[PDB]
Design an enzyme around this catalytic site. Structure first.
Site, PDB file in Angstrom:
ATOM      1  N   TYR A 116       0.825  -1.191   0.000  1.00  0.00           N
ATOM      2  CA  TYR A 116       0.000   0.000   0.000  1.00  0.00           C
ATOM      3  C   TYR A 116       0.859   1.240   0.000  1.00  0.00           C
ATOM      4  O   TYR A 116       2.017   1.206   0.436  1.00  0.00           O
ATOM      5  CB  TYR A 116      -0.957   0.017   1.190  1.00  0.00           C
ATOM      6  CG  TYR A 116      -0.309  -0.126   2.536  1.00  0.00           C
ATOM      7  CD1 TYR A 116       0.150   0.992   3.231  1.00  0.00           C
ATOM      8  CD2 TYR A 116      -0.196  -1.364   3.136  1.00  0.00           C
ATOM      9  CE1 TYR A 116       0.729   0.867   4.472  1.00  0.00           C
ATOM     10  CE2 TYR A 116       0.380  -1.495   4.373  1.00  0.00           C
ATOM     11  CZ  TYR A 116       0.832  -0.365   5.045  1.00  0.00           C
ATOM     12  OH  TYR A 116       1.391  -0.496   6.287  1.00  0.00           O
ATOM     13  N   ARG A 150       4.677   0.509   0.861  1.00  0.00           N
ATOM     14  CA  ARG A 150       5.141  -0.573   1.734  1.00  0.00           C
ATOM     15  C   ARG A 150       5.099  -1.902   0.986  1.00  0.00           C
ATOM     16  O   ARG A 150       4.129  -2.169   0.288  1.00  0.00           O
ATOM     17  CB  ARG A 150       4.266  -0.724   2.974  1.00  0.00           C
ATOM     18  CG  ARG A 150       4.173   0.490   3.883  1.00  0.00           C
ATOM     19  CD  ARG A 150       5.514   1.023   4.378  1.00  0.00           C
ATOM     20  NE  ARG A 150       6.531   0.007   4.661  1.00  0.00           N
ATOM     21  CZ  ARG A 150       6.551  -0.852   5.681  1.00  0.00           C
ATOM     22  NH1 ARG A 150       5.578  -0.907   6.576  1.00  0.00           N
ATOM     23  NH2 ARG A 150       7.570  -1.698   5.782  1.00  0.00           N
ATOM     24  N   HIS A 170       3.226  -6.863   4.114  1.00  0.00           N
ATOM     25  CA  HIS A 170       3.794  -7.247   5.400  1.00  0.00           C
ATOM     26  C   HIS A 170       2.735  -7.559   6.443  1.00  0.00           C
ATOM     27  O   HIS A 170       1.601  -7.090   6.357  1.00  0.00           O
ATOM     28  CB  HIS A 170       4.719  -6.140   5.933  1.00  0.00           C
ATOM     29  CG  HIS A 170       4.009  -4.857   6.200  1.00  0.00           C
ATOM     30  ND1 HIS A 170       3.744  -3.942   5.207  1.00  0.00           N
ATOM     31  CD2 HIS A 170       3.457  -4.358   7.330  1.00  0.00           C
ATOM     32  CE1 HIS A 170       3.068  -2.929   5.712  1.00  0.00           C
ATOM     33  NE2 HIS A 170       2.891  -3.150   7.002  1.00  0.00           N
ATOM     34  N   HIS A 205       2.437  -7.244  10.627  1.00  0.00           N
ATOM     35  CA  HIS A 205       3.038  -6.757  11.869  1.00  0.00           C
ATOM     36  C   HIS A 205       2.992  -7.869  12.929  1.00  0.00           C
ATOM     37  O   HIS A 205       1.986  -8.584  13.039  1.00  0.00           O
ATOM     38  CB  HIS A 205       2.255  -5.546  12.390  1.00  0.00           C
ATOM     39  CG  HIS A 205       2.304  -4.364  11.477  1.00  0.00           C
ATOM     40  ND1 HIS A 205       3.224  -3.351  11.625  1.00  0.00           N
ATOM     41  CD2 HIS A 205       1.557  -4.036  10.397  1.00  0.00           C
ATOM     42  CE1 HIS A 205       3.056  -2.460  10.664  1.00  0.00           C
ATOM     43  NE2 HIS A 205       2.041  -2.848   9.915  1.00  0.00           N
TER      44      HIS A 205
HETATM   45 FE    FE Z   1       1.488  -1.852   8.070  1.00  0.00          FE
END
Ligand code: FE
Ligand code: FE
Ligand code: FE
EC number: 1.13.11.3
Lengths: 238, 200, 238, 200, 237, 200, 200
Positions: A147, A157, A160, A162
């Site tokens: 995104y 980014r 991913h 977290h």
């Molecule tokens: Fe994130």
């Protein structure tokens, strides 16, 4: 109650990202300018919460079912699994692993995310579990999308998830991000590159794990986590 | 030299940390059990107190997306590690600052004294870890209490801070919120009045 | 009407996949066992349809809008763009490019696809366009997901978009598959590996193209296509 | 030697080819204009004919997911390349076999004679390209007509097939479908009666 | 009458020099400490002046004749020529290229330059031109000398010519410096080294171009310039 | 990924920039036509305004060698790219600070409203690029007007600046100079009151 | 990707496999306990059946050196993994074809119905692994029963075989041998009537 009976290997703060990494613009105003003050380990630092008696819901680790509003989420079905060990290679059992992520299109279920990629009515993007007695964890989810974000004018980014891991003490607690094998966005990301050592970045890249896939169903990725090494005290106060 | 397996490197918690770790603060539905900011049931032993604070960046602006974890002894100086929502007291908790609530709160008891590894009493303190967008690895600090001046002056950890002016940054200010005993602990990440942060 | 005025460079059928590639199981019974018969180029082979006068709908090239049932599709928003040239490097203008694909979770909008990953009510997975006067095409879509298939017991297609390109003649017409840079499934796929030459496989891998992205909106991938070289006739019938 | 840019390599069309190239055959909604199997409007010049056939694999089983493209001269021996749904005749079309319809059909006219590059007449023919799951690169063939025996015997392309028995595989059989003139052209990909496939 | 019909590839600000490069001392106090704020391209950023109808004097591109006070300047006669293209390789025609430089001894014709190397009475050090329809520019000049400056205690700029290029929009406008092939001062210069990537430094080094020389007259150097890639808008709202 | 030709890297304009780009400001002879600081002849449509400002470094000291380029819409909100000294109005100009004159000036008209790419009106603004010794790549900013408060509050570019306090740095202050409407726009490159600089 | 230790690769059992795995069939002395072809003692519950078959190569010739291993549920649909010659029933056995006896035999009971992993009933079956010279890695198949037509039609494993004609290759033919219920199950390794072989 908790007791002070162990020591944790000191962190390498050149392996971790430094505080001030200006290409990641928000770090400029949110990095201390004074040196950290080193303090010796005491019971305050060498203990921490254990979550064996936290009550988990049936689907807390299964993002395909834990936001069920009439259907399955859209996106790449995956298992994310791995082992939590310390730096001496000792498994870390019964430890809290939490995770959160965007949906298949890179949209988070948070008010502050106004990305034009739509929300998925059957995806929430939050999971948790405990590692088992041998240090292993697993989640089922959909692969998140990359995104865009307001850093440089065309920054994105990599996909991913977290992660947060408690470990045996507040000294071991870690928050990080898992990236996916081969993603061409990884080398370009100023958050990834807050980590100066390329070998350290590689430790955050989950590997495709065909051995753990459910055929005709879902793929799998493997993400092993290493927390600070724990040892017994020796020759203290003498 | 002997080189162990490297630790997995840290990354920022990012701006959406609350969806994973502070679901109520995120305005999203909660699960049956959540780890949050009420460490003490009303009948827990000790002096019941409210802790609150705001977090500032290097430009003096509010951090409205922080996430904090806390770890403290109970009133009897014991760390209660068997986390359970049914416990009278949990030594661990979580809180946050958000767009709607820029000031974090914690409901707890004043911690008892614990000794350091050499047997020297530490002043009453709360261990805090701070996470947020822009923070690549979490920041460790301690909250001490302004009405424990005698103990603070003798604390072996406070005394590792070379400058008295910097020690002052860790001393929470007694106040009253809705008439009830409270301590305010503002954190300044960078610049004037920068809060002491620890490595261990 | 069409005229015979050009010749096309002969195909390298060791660069293309061979017919019989048994690890791709369906090829075993669908591969000729007799040799192909070579025939000289005539007007029958060196001409073909041109689609300049085909009527395209406004959203034929935009998979984010061409199956609109009240919302946007879920998944990674991408532009797929590139140039069609021949082997001499000459652009191929006004040529028909068609594409089809699964949704973000690897599900196709076809009755015969019973994969348990759900359909997306706002995604159809079909596009077409003509190359422009300089040989360039573009589509907007979501990145398709990988999916399992009944080949070996744990076989998964890499994420891919199917392409068909007409070119100047029936001799140039091609159907192929586009794969995505870095996908760890690519080296494992028996359909990819129907192509024996690793350099040929690389020609099917679209590259992340940050230069062509719409910031805060969509990423972009670049997939250039090379059709058979076209030359004038020379010294024939003399 | 001189090495040009390599051609993009082929891959199978796969089992869902119809969603991209045969939308009606896929049972999905169509666009305003589609390239399909009616090459001739009713008033196109020439003899109107139906072509049909089935496609078999090496085990003698029906291929129920094939996709075919065809290219033929008009009745006057001219290739009409300016594709348009308003044309009386298009030289190009598409058809398919499916789970519901294992037999493909084409509505066209019998093609006129065209000369090869040396000026020698070829017998009337339809150029066919066959695509499917399991077919890594499309197969080229030609459909000739059993009522053009004299022309077929002199065709410079048929005569490049060394064995007369193999030439027979390209000769479509005149028949009648719903009382109307038709030719059946079955394709056998592999094994007994294997259809001749071309390279050019 | 200017229109928003194009987008420009985002700059790589690790290819360009960063703002804070402390070995170049003046940058310490003249570098922002806050992050740049990214904004989307609009007509404000994607348009700019076109100088096709700016009136040029006959010798504006010829520094051997544009400060004529009775003779020719002293120094190495050179042509400086090149092409302006964008990152997609597209030529940038009819664009404004401006340049300025010291004389053969490293002295500028500005009151603030008190270097003891003398001024040349027949040299001003200023040029301008438009690229032609194929994107090519050319100047005739003398090769500038290196000169000392008050940075470190023995710092010397390599020989250089300052350049400014307008390009199609304010987003493409660039100021830079041209250096000369082989100059041993280049690797030592803290202004050169404000550019962190050695491959980027190489892009500022003009190459000796014997092919373009006038025999028995003047040498030539080639300096090609790449401006931000321009593309059409696509799929915006 | 796809990598294009790299852009030619920037370098500082250096202390003698005026000899090349601001000849009158350098105290040197001018050519017949120069690009300078009068965007509007007196006869141009719109509200005629004087703009002036000073430039400061991080120690609060005047920058006496800066070079500024400006780009703005005419009073009707149209950018005029056909630069010509015969025009009543040009959208582009240049100005400078020097040792003799530390305050730059511009003579122009107030720009009209221009929509962003999404069709949303931007508040009236002048685009500025700042060059000088010590500045390795030029700094982009915008000058807005304090008498356009309503428009400024709604500007989609101003609203990308996270902190309201920083938005204030781009608002020029209306005053009168010798009876004529003027606005002051000071730029602070570094430190307290640091001017917002853009990337695009 | 994650790569585990590779499996030890297979090799053919070779022509003398019986000396190691079928000692009686090899014409050699046996040890006190051997794993052989009687899965059921006469007293075992269920329908006692004789199974027999021949194995053919791709030229239609008998394979006279094969070794077969079988695995089946008891009559109640339970697999019995505790192998013991004292058991009335064992789920596992071995048989062989030899030069003297080209037709293998098994003495067992008809297996009960077993559900697949999704809870769907599979038709009664015996799992077979086939080894021999010329077979580099053993071939897996299943023996189903022609008197279980209804169950066979609904078996989720049989239904993974795309062609009905190939499903027929796994159906053993009921007959009577010396008054006792028997089924013949011939295996054709290659060519016409080729037996379906599985991967799992
Ligand atoms: Fe994130
Ligand atoms: Fe596919
Ligand atoms: Fe200079």
């Amino acid at each position: 109650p908790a007791q002070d009976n162990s020591r944790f290997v000191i962190r390498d703060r050149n392996w971790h990202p430094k505080a001030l990494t200006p290409d990641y613009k928000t770090s400029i105003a949110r990095s201390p300018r004074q040196a950290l003050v080193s303090i010796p380990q005491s019971i305050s630092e060498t203990t921490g919460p254990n979550f064996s008696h936290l009550g988990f819901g049936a689907h807390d680790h299964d993002l395909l079912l834990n936001f069920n509003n009439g259907g399955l989420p859209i996106g790449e079905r995956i298992i994310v699994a791995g082992r939590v060990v310390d730096q001496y290679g000792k498994p870390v059992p019964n430890t809290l692993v939490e995770m959160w992520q965007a949906n298949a299109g890179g949209r988070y279920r948070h008010k502050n995310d106004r990305y034009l990629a739509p929300l998925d009515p059957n995806f929430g993007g939050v999971g948790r579990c405990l590692t088992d007695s041998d240090g292993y964890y697993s989640f089922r989810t959909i692969k998140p999308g990359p995104y865009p974000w307001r850093n440089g004018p065309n920054d994105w980014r990599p996909a991913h998830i977290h992660f947060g891991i408690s470990g045996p003490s507040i000294a071991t607690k870690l928050i990080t991000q898992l990236y996916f094998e081969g993603d061409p966005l990884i080398p370009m990301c100023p958050i990834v590159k807050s980590i100066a050592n390329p070998e350290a970045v590689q430790q955050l890249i989950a590997k495709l794990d065909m051995n753990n896939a459910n055929p005709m169903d879902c793929l799998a990725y493997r993400f092993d986590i290493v927390l600070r090494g724990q040892r017994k005290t020796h020759f203290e106060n003498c | 030299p002997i080189e162990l397996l490297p630790e997995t490197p840290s990354q920022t918690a990012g701006p959406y940390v609350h969806i994973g770790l502070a679901l109520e603060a995120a305005g999203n539905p909660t699960r049956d059990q959540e780890i949050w900011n009420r460490l003490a049931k009303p009948d827990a032993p000790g002096e019941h107190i409210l802790l609150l604070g705001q977090v500032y960046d290097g430009n003096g602006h509010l951090v409205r997306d922080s996430f904090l974890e806390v770890w403290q002894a109970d009133a009897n100086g014991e760390y209660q590690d068997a986390y359970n929502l049914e416990n009278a007291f949990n030594s661990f908790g979580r809180t946050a600052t958000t767009f709607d609530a820029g000031e974090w709160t914690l409901h707890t008891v004043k911690p008892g004294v614990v000794n350091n590894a050499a047997g020297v009493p530490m002043a009453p303190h709360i261990n805090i870890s701070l996470f947020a967008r822009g923070i690549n690895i979490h920041l460790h600090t301690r909250l001490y209490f302004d009405d424990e001046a005698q103990a603070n002056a003798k604390c072996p950890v406070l005394n590792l801070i070379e400058q008295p002016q910097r020690r002052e940054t860790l001393i929470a200010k007694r106040c009253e919120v809705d008439g009830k005993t409270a301590y305010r602990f503002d954190i300044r990440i960078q610049g004037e009045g920068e809060t002491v942060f620890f490595d261990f």
